[PDB]
Amino acid sequence: RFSVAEHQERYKEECQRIFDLQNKVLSSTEVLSTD
Amino acid sequence: IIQHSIPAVELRQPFFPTHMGPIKLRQFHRPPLKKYSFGALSQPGPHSVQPLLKHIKKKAKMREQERQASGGGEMFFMRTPQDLTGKDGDLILAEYSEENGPLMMQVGMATKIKNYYKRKPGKDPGAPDCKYGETVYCHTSPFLGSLHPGQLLQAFENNLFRAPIYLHKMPETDFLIIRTRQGYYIRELVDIFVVGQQCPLFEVPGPNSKRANTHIRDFLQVFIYRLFWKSKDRPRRIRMEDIKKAFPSHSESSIRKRLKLCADFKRTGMDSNWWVLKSDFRLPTEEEIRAMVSPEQCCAYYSMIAAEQRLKDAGDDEVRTAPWNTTRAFIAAMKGKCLLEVTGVADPTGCGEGFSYVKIP
Amino acid sequence: PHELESQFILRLPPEYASTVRRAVQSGHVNLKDRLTIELHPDGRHGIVRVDRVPLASKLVDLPCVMESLKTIDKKTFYKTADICQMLVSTEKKFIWNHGITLPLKNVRKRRFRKTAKDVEKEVKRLLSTDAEAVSTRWEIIAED
Amino acid sequence: RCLKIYRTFRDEEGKEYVRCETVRKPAVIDAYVRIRTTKDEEF
């Protein structure tokens, strides 16, 4: 029933994941098809 | 550490507007192409664009002569409004990912490019070198995530925010046309950065806050002092309807409250219908007036009133996405007060990319 | 006084963009005669004439906000203007959905969060018509 | 629910034409009604 390390680590990992998804999508030089 | 231009730290009125109406708050940081009434471009017809490459290299050679005449160190050049033209210097472009950021720089303000480079475990060759900015080795990631070993990330760093930027080459078809009253001018661009989600370092105040009303009062006082400095009359005197032209949403009781101390109204005789400066009042020096209001406080106030307009036009989820809430949430998360739900509705993308800065316990 | 400069982006067809780029990087005033811009009183229509060849232009609104940043030492950058408009050469039509950079494509449709409840101006016109009237009758309706 | 408005006006010379106008835009609706409800309380 963690109320301390579980919440903190979960928030931290979601933060690294979003930071790393944004870096990749933004630096992509891949052409994107007009929709 | 950030040194803005002398038009920016003196809060001069083209660059830092005193009043923004509703149609000017909807077009906040998106200024439309205005039609001129007088000038060379005001006459209808075809207009030749003018190349400016002798102007660029003449100005750069002149600034290098100024720098080598002053001992060769690093110099401060942006001292006039005519230094802030696009006609000279090395221009880059900076595109924003979010539609309406929580904070945004006014014209004339400075920012730095910092290249954060986490070394590889043990031996590393050195930071991949980059054309713009200075490199710094970051063990502790500035942003929410953490840098990989051997990963260099460039970022805009100033007093307002800190945001990851990504250098892209320009399209092969796009040029930059600087139009003024006299004619069109064309530059090419080669470097364009994409600015990610901002990490706010300044807290936008809320509407009717104490910090909000304090900034409004201090801005009006600074404008009144600078009108008194501009007065040529030996007893310095100003007119009330100059201030009413600058701040037309203000009730005149507040303007008279600011003029009550430091001025008095002359009805008859000489200086009639003028607000002369009191003889015992020492008008503050330039550095005291600069210490009264900061330009970043003006940017935070402009963000607040623009978000006020957008929320007002669109009739609690939207209120959470207001920059006073999101800036308070992010700065509180950086002190370790609270955590943020990184997936939510304050997400400026509207998809899984990007963060949401709203407080969670 | 000082008036903030108004910078916009000009997008040309690729062969005409190559000729304009070569003439810009050359640097003579010969380019001045070759490249002209005529903006129509619509405000969103124009001709760009490259080498006296007319091209049809539209001034469109860009979904993101760009900012020109000048520098003298390539370490500190000063914001010079805000760019929000592009004169592409070849209302809903005057709004551009894509951004200039490659990662920003279909930004307005996909990477922009949309919050919703011209329309205000229409409501003002309706209020003016109600004022110029004598008797006003209103009912929220159903299918009819 | 859509919004329909009936307007009574006087034409040049002598006339009393009535115009019934229906607003199907729910955005125009909201902004329209909010002023009346405000002006109804503004008395």
Chains that touch B (3 or more CB pairs under 8 A): A, C
Q: Which two tokens stand for residue C109?
A: 């449709």
Q: Tell me which residue of D23, D41, D42 sits closest to D31, measured CA to CA.
A: D23
Q: Which two tokens stand for residue B350?
A: 């509207």
CB within 8 Å of B123: residues ≥ 6 apart: none
| Residue B33 with chain C: CB contacts under 8 Å | 6, 8, 43, 59, 85
User: Any CB–CB contact under 8 A between A16 and chain C?
Assistant: no
Chain C: give the shortest CA distance to residue A32, in Å. Answer: 6
| Residue A27 with chain C: CB contacts under 8 Å | 103
Q: Tell me which residue of B182, B20, B165, B161 sits closest to B85, measured CA to CA.
A: B182
**Closest chain C CA to residue A27:** C103
Q: Count CB neighbours of C38 within 10 A.
A: 15
How far is the C-alpha of B189 from the C-alpha of B95, rounded, in Å?
Answer: 13
Q: Which residue from B14, B97, B174 is facing C100, i.e. has the nearest CB?
A: B174
Q: Which two tokens stand for residue B351?
A: 């998809």
Q: Count CB neighbours of B16 within 10 A.
A: 22
Question: If DSSP states are collapsed to H, E and C, what string results for chain B?
Answer: CCCCCHHHHCCCCCCCCCCCCHHHHHCCCCCCCCCCCCCCCCCCCCEEEEECCHHHHHHHHHHHHHHHHCCCCCCCCCCCHHHHCCCCCCCEEEEECCCCCCCCCCCCCEEEEEEEECCCCCCCCCCCCCCCCEEECCCCCCCCCCCCCCCEEEEEECCCEEEEEEEEECCCCEEEEEECCCCEEEEECCEEEEECCCEECCCCCCCCCHHHHHHHHHHHHHHHHHHHHCCCCCCCEECHHHHHHHCCCCCHHHHHHHHHCCEEEECCCCCCCEEEECCCCCCCCHHHHHHHCCHHHHHHHHHHHHHHHHHHHCCCHHHHCCHHHHHHHHHHHHHCCCEECCCCCCCCCCCCCCCCCCEEC
Q: What is the resolution of this structure in A?
A: 3.3
User: Any CB–CB contact under 8 A between C114 and chain B?
Assistant: yes
How far is the C-alpha of B337 from the C-alpha of A15, rounded, in Å?
Answer: 17
Q: Tell me which residue of B309, B104, B348, B33 sits closest to C107, measured CA to CA.
A: B348
How far is the C-alpha of C124 from the C-alpha of C128, rounded, in Å?
Answer: 6
Chain C: give the shortest CA distance to residue B276, in Å. Answer: 25
Chains that touch D (3 or more CB pairs under 8 A): C
| Residue B95 with chain C: CB contacts under 8 Å | 64-66, 99-101, 104
User: Any CB–CB contact under 8 A between B197 and chain A?
Assistant: yes
Q: Which amino acid is at B202?
A: F
Breaks (C-N over 2.5 A) in chain C follow: 90, 117
DSSP C40: -
CA-to-CA separations, B19 to B228, B244, B290, B309, C26, in angstroms, rounded = 20, 11, 20, 13, 44
CA angle D30, D32, D34 (to 5 degrees): 65
CA atoms in the 13 A half-sphere facing the CB of B90: 14
Interface with chain C: mutation pick from B167, B177, B299, highest number of C CBs within 10 Å: B177
Q: Do chains C and D touch (3 or more CB pairs under 8 A)?
A: yes
